Symmetry: C3
């Protein structure tokens, strides 16, 4: 099975906020200035999670201003991320509308744009809705069919499975799914969707998701990439995961800073020298396990970005479900958290 | 994707024998008396594996006697387990017949019954046979369509795969598979079906089965639960697995005793206090590896419940297959087990 | 689900070159002399990877000469491996042609041949092409339909997935896929196909591939087997993997030497004695990590069999992709490898 895109491999997939609460295109203009090993193979001005939602309409204008003035020199491929969601026609329509604004050829961005990145997709028929949107945007703006590459973030159970019959869905003459380019794991939301929880709240490793995504990319002629690694300071951990991914055939990974771009650009390359193997630094050695109360102070005082919120919303949710349906447990639950904490936890949206 | 059931989460799935070889409803009457943290979110009077087969017709009567007299006060949901098997129309018919007896509304049980648990299912079309049985039972007894929740034990290769296209099978207008509620791993029989074997005979961990089941529950709007943890004394191991499951998004687990119900009810809840992390007790420290002879003494003298039998039937089976088809090996096999052990092992049903 | 073949289990799957660059049937004639624990349950004269390609037409004649003169006494089942490839009609046609030569009943081999082993298969419709070839070979040579067992090496992403709907594909009246017997992992080429890479170049472990293959064999009534373990000297490692496989329900494994046949024949059998568990030898303790330069000396001087070549072709390929598309990185890449190494690496076919 063969890849349909100019980039046979992609080591770095680097996101930037598109409009910050100054010159709101700040992050974009600098990220566009990156050259050499500090530049990602793929650059993602991110109008989705990186960007506060009320900044999002401005983000799309900034995407057009910055790629307009500066896209031409940017050495990698550019693929901004739209909003989208398998469960939310308004979000779908929003993403398509931004996509349509961004690509108006009279504005100078489109010709430096290689494609777009569609977060939160569902089952294959949700992928077909996005693909249909790309087809329409292309037609409205005299671009060639298939020229906008679509890449998807795999971040629900449904989308992990959808990778299974992609080879044959993709060849139906009623979609243009050949446009698929990257299959990008999104451990953060995948964790929410799967209702998983860890005692520290660090992402579970999901080796099977990563296998499944490497498999799907290989069987369908796409390129697999792994998702953000948030602990930016933990250079060793980031290299350890990239090495683990490389043993899955997942060869690119998300980068969050220009230092991550450098680690990421370098890791899959063979080392300079040979090597022989044998049979406040304290912070990178400490992980905290929050208490019910910790988590409810924290949430309470959040009203940490969205994703820290939703992550903890799980044990709290399991708590609320339990509280709502187990009167018989009401007493022992209180005898264990204090009556104050309990009806405080009950209050978390 | 959304859950169709009153219980958004289920931490404990607790089984009890329905008729023991006294008052044979003993186990049921006491388990029905459980309140607070000793009570499971889901209670499973088990007319299948917990119960000797010749006690099974009596079990179904006891299910009706006990839930009749006592169901009304039971604080969790009640879901008795029927017999069933993808390979055995008699078993299927038996399960449906017990189901039909149990729900006669003139008997007082049905109104405290939330649904049933169907063991040993196969490919999705085997799930449709069970669902058809629920539909018919409902109609015969003026219950509302879909009101009996069906939960399945995932304990064959076929049923692990069947979870893959569930979202779309479930929406066909010819089944009522929306009734699905729990997807419950059954490591014990899954191990038999997959012909796996371990040197101690302890269950392999099957992280992928558990991933696959969390994924399937999330993509189809069901709740994932893990299977019995037999080493009841190994409190640490049970918490270690529940924690491992929780990192898969598998949040409930089977409980075999009221102490397991307590561990299980407590584990997925956030801890009371914060915690900081840094980079004849002898029996819980010893595992025996049986010898061919051990295993044949043991089996021989069994003629350990069913499942210990079937588990060891695997290496013995591989032995018999080998013996039947490799005359050239007959000599070295004997020179290694003794001629006595060999034709003794050859005799194991 | 039930197995359709004489051998319910298969512990050893042993390959031999069919024609070596003397008497080119050497390897075959001796391997055919093996008896007892040194004999595999399944013997694979290998006209594919074991054999240089220009020796392949001679291999097929040797298969007929040796099985002719000696097949009758060989105590296991015999299943030679043909060439094949999901991407290469010439290879497919070649495999079928050798298969057709081999089975001419006037030549004495066919009656000691149990079936054939088809490497490199793709999606299920590629399996149907091979099956069609078996059907035709059978008909041309008055053999009974279905009497040649087909076994496949699982060594692409596509073929791992193809195992998913096998139970139902297999029952269509337009193929004879009941003939399926073994599902054999091929970690070596699977690693290429998935574009995985390890720092030592040792095969990644691919537990999920192995799970998926045990699952597929169980759901479809085939027997799962694992792929070659190249480090022939590492007896401990080979037993450790076989034990790991056995916990997946993968009970046979590839053997490369008569000593591996002996380990392999013995490992899944229960131990002789009980056992109690508690809570230049230097070479088997050293692994080398090659440098870019190492890998390019090595490749350069290869123009190590095919598979060592293709394996390293991955980081080199990722290097070339990067070099071709990242001018901005050209300077730092050189400042790190030397300008000599770089345009030398650029030259690797
Ligand atoms: Cl929707
Ligand atoms: Cl984890
Ligand atoms: Cl899978
Ligand atoms: Cl890839
Ligand atoms: Cl049946
Ligand atoms: Cl294990
Ligand atoms: Cl769940
Ligand atoms: Cl082809
Ligand atoms: Cl590995
Ligand atoms: Cl098997
Ligand atoms: K999101
Ligand atoms: K298409
Ligand atoms: K089209
Ligand atoms: K891959
Ligand atoms: K059973
Ligand atoms: K339905
Ligand atoms: K219906
Ligand atoms: K889940
Ligand atoms: K090959
Ligand atoms: K067929
Ligand atoms: K047929
Ligand atoms: K198996
Ligand atoms: Mg996300
Ligand atoms: Mg069972
Ligand atoms: Mg191969």
């Amino acid at each position: 099975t063969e890849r349909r895109h100019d980039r046979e491999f992609v080591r770095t997939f680097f996101t930037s906020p598109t409009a910050v609460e100054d010159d709101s295109a700040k992050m974009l203009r600098r990220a566009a200035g990156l050259r050499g090993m500090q530049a990602p193979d793929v650059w993602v001005p991110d109008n989705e999670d990186a960007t506060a939602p009320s900044m999002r309409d401005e983000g799309a204008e900034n995407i057009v201003e910055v790629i307009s003035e500066q896209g031409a020199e940017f050495p990698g491929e550019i693929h901004p991320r739209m909003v989208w969601h398998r469960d939310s026609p308004e979000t779908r329509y929003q993403g398509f509308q931004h996509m349509l604004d961004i690509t108006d050829p009279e504005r100078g961005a489109v010709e430096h744009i290689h494609g777009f990145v569609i977060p939160e997709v569902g089952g294959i028929d949700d992928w077909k809705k996005a693909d249909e949107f790309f087809t329409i945007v292309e037609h409205e703006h005299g671009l060639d069919e298939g020229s906008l590459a679509m890449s998807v973030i795999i971040e629900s159970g449904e989308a992990e499975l959808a990778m299974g019959d992609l080879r044959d869905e993709m060849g139906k003459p009623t979609n243009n799914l050949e446009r698929l380019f990257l299959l990008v794991d999104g451990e953060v939301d995948y964790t929410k969707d799967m209702r998983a929880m860890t005692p520290t709240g660090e992402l579970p490793a999901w080796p099977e998701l990563r296998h499944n995504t490497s498999r799907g990319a290989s069987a369908a002629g796409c390129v697999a990439v792994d998702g953000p690694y948030d602990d930016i300071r933990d250079v060793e951990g980031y290299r350890e995961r990239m090495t683990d991914n490389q043993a899955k055939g997942m060869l690119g990974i998300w980068s969050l800073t220009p230092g991550q771009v450098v680690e990421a650009n370098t890791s899959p390359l063979p080392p300079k020298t040979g090597s022989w193997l044998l049979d406040e630094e304290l912070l990178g050695l400490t992980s905290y396990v929050p208490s019910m109360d910790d988590i409810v102070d924290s949430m309470e005082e959040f009203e940490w970005d969205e994703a820290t919120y939703q992550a903890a919303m799980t044990p709290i949710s399991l708590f609320q479900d339990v509280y709502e349906n187990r009167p018989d447990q009401h007493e022992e639950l209180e005898e264990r958290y204090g009556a104050g904490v309990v009806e405080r936890a009950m209050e978390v949206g």
